[PDB]
Amino acid sequence: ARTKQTARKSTGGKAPGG
Amino acid sequence: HMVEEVLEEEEEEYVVEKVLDRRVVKGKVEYLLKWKGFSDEDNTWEPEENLDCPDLIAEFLQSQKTAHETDKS
């Protein structure tokens, strides 16, 4: 239940999708 | 809604395995991090401030310490 460690990799931009 | 049009910033809390190392440059801070799913080659040191996993950070220096700085901390 506890939140697992996470770090923003400064992705930004925008998902390509489809 | 009904405000400034979005078109900037889009950081996401991507799952992190563990910080590989640590290095400072210019004056900022960045820790190497292995990203799940993405090839290891896609390595990228993200700013500590951005990182939302202080526990992992401590985990890294935890081993190197017990000698690190040889003072407080």
UniProtKB/Swiss-Prot annotation, chain A:
The modification Phosphoarginine is found at R2. The modification N6,N6,N6-trimethyllysine is found at K4, K9. It is found in: Nucleus; Chromosome. The modification N6-acetyllysine is found at K4, K9, K14. Core component of nucleosome. Nucleosomes wrap and compact DNA into chromatin, limiting DNA accessibility to the cellular machineries which require DNA as a template. Histones thereby play a central role in transcription regulation, DNA repair, DNA replication and chromosomal stability. DNA accessibility is regulated via a complex set of post-translational modifications of histones, also called histone code, and nucleosome remodeling. Belongs to the histone H3 family. This is Histone H3.1. The lineage of its organism: Eukaryota, Metazoa, Chordata, Craniata, Vertebrata.
Swiss-Prot record, chain B:
Residues 14-72 form the Chromo domain. There is a cross-link at K26 (Glycyl lysine isopeptide (Lys-Gly) (interchain with G-Cter in SUMO2)). The record marks V16, L33, W35, L51, C53 as: Histone H3A7 binding. It is found in: Nucleus. The record marks Y14, W35, F38 as: Histone H3K9me2 binding. Not phosphorylated. Ubiquitinated. In all adult and embryonic tissues. Component of heterochromatin. Recognizes and binds histone H3 tails methylated at 'Lys-9', leading to epigenetic repression. Interaction with lamin B receptor (LBR) can contribute to the association of the heterochromatin with the inner nuclear membrane. Homodimer. Interacts directly with CHAF1A, EMSY, LBR, TIF1/TIF1A and TRIM28/TIF1B PXVXL motif via the chromoshadow domain. Interacts directly with histone H3 methylated at 'Lys-9' via the chromo domain. Interacts with SUV39H1, SETDB1, KMT5B and KMT5C. Interacts with PRDM6. Interacts with POGZ. Interacts with CHAMP1. Interacts with INCENP. Interacts with SGO1; the CBX1 homodimer binds to one molecule of SGO1. Interacts with LRIF1 (via PxVxL motif). Interacts with HDGFL2. Interacts with CHD3. Interacts with CHD4. This is Chromobox protein homolog 1. The gene is Cbx1.
